[PDB]
């Protein structure tokens, strides 16, 4: 309950760099239909927003500035909006990948033409001759890794949102 | 500097969560011959001991009766040993994945029972005309993703070990 007003800024900075690095890392070509997480280009601007929010509070510890508090609460409102948007998109993406493909979400050419003949949503043996094949096993491993990455991202986003809710007051 | 070492306890806690979560993520059966980082189970114990040290690091930040001075040397030495072991493991694994492996490091059975037929070390069919198959593209994508993960982990481990070395000095 309102422990410290400064030590959380470094945490927010590191989570912002976390989102930026994850967004940069998850740009590898995977299927014609890229995941909705990267098509929107959400992680990069989200992470830059978190890094700016952290830089605005981690190393200031000051008051008696009207502009400072105005910008702080406005950017906190945008941070809440970004957090809820990220939660919604993560839930939609995990439900789309896990359950069944229902959205196209075409992406840019430089991340789509690299792998234009592969699928990462429903890759099951159409014929029994490839029930246990390297292609389907590799796609299953890719899907499992993507599910794990999405779960980790959702957990970290939930923790960060809880931290913000505890720091909004 | 030593003046503001209190704020880094949560940083070390987050680093421990990093080690534990990434160990759990890499625990998945990505090929028969798993990277040496996950076979030795270094990330799990490294993260747990970072968690313990960070919990003790931000206990009181002062001189109690007997609460901090006893650990401030032993746990710092353990953290330094963990950091050097981790960077050694990372620089060994990057070479073992970039160059043909000379360690076996067989994966454990209870995870190998899921996907026991994935080969990354030599995924090149003898047919030169077979290079256009999607299997080769999948193997190349897996190799690129693993290279990116190893590079990011090495960079972040170097950053955390250098900041810890600077703080303890």
């Amino acid at each position, epitope marked *: 309950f309102m422990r410290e007003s400064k030590t959380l800024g470094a945490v927010q900075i590191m989570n912002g760099l976390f989102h930026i690095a994850l967004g940069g890392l998850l740009m590898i070509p995977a299927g014609i239909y890229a995941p909705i997480c990267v098509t929107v280009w959400y992680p990069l601007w989200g992470g830059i927003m978190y890094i700016i929010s952290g830089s605005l509070l981690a190393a200031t510890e000051k008051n008696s500035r009207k502009c400072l508090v105005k910008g702080k609460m406005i950017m906190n409102s945008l941070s809440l909006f970004a957090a809820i948007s990220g939660m919604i998109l993560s839930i939609m993406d995990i439900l789309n990948i896990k359950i069944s493909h229902f959205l196209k979400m075409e992406s840019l050419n430089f991340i789509r033409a690299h792998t234009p003949y592969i699928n990462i949503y429903n890759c099951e043996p*159409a*014929n*029994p*001759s*490839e029930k*246990n*094949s*390297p*292609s389907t096993q590799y796609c299953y491993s890719i899907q499992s890794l993507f599910l794990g990455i999405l779960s980790v991202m959702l957990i970290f986003a939930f923790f960060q949102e809880l931290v913000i809710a505890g720091i909004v007051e | 500097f030593m003046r503001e070492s209190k704020t880094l306890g949560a940083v070390q806690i987050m680093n421990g969560l990093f080690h534990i979560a990434l160990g759990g993520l890499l625990m998945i059966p990505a090929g028969i011959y798993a990277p040496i980082c996950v076979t030795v189970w270094y990330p799990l114990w490294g993260g747990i001991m970072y968690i313990i040290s960070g919990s003790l690091l931000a206990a009181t930040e002062k001189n109690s009766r007997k609460c901090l001075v006893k650990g401030k040397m032993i746990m710092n030495s353990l953290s330094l040993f963990a950091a050097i072991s981790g960077m050694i493991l990372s620089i060994m694994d990057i070479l073992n994945i970039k160059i043909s492996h000379f360690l076996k490091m067989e994966s454990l059975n209870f995870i190998r029972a899921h996907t026991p*037929y994935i080969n990354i070390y030599n995924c090149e069919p003898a047919n030169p*005309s077979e290079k256009n*198959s*999607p*299997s080769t593209q999948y193997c190349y994508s897996i190799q690129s993703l693993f290279l990116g993960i190893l590079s990011v982990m090495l960079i972040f481990a170097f950053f955390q070990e250098l900041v810890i070395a600077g703080i303890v000095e």
Partner: antibody
Amino acid sequence: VQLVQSGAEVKKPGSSVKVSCKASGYAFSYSWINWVRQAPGQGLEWMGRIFPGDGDTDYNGKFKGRVTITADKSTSTAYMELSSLRSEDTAVYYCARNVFDGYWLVYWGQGTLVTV
Amino acid sequence: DIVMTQTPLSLPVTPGEPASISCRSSKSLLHSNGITYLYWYLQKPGQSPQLLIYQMSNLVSGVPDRFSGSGSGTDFTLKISRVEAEDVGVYYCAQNLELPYTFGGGTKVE
């Protein structure tokens, strides 16, 4: 890669016959073994398939499960085991190696004919 | 299961002009993936069987150059620009999408 199969054998109705389809020059556990029989009067007819890596097996289901197929990893050779052969079952059997990702049954075998 | 019918059954050999092998599937073979699987076999005495055409889009190396093949999804036709006496034999049409596998009756060409 080379495929060596045993010579033709002459049998009698109601007996049992075994054929050795030796495999060499490739990864025996990285290919699904397919067996196809050819009888006079009509074309080819699939009968069964086996995967020696995990022991998974498939059957045509045309008959009441009379097909019994097993594989040995130590020798990398699959064996034929059929009970109570009949006159109508007199045909030549071929063991073929499959290639994944498009080349379904490009590789064939020498084949072995059985007469009862 | 799945039964295939082909015609003509005999198709006497005549070099150059006449060359047409037709096969059809009774289950309207289509997996909605944009492609349809089809295979062709040649059985001439003297050697073991070999693959000729795979899903009617490309051919294995070493095949005679004057070979082709296409289809629509329900009726499949095989066309040869110039048939020769060297590559004489029977034609087998095959489908592999569900168990059990069934092979065509073949067209005995003499």
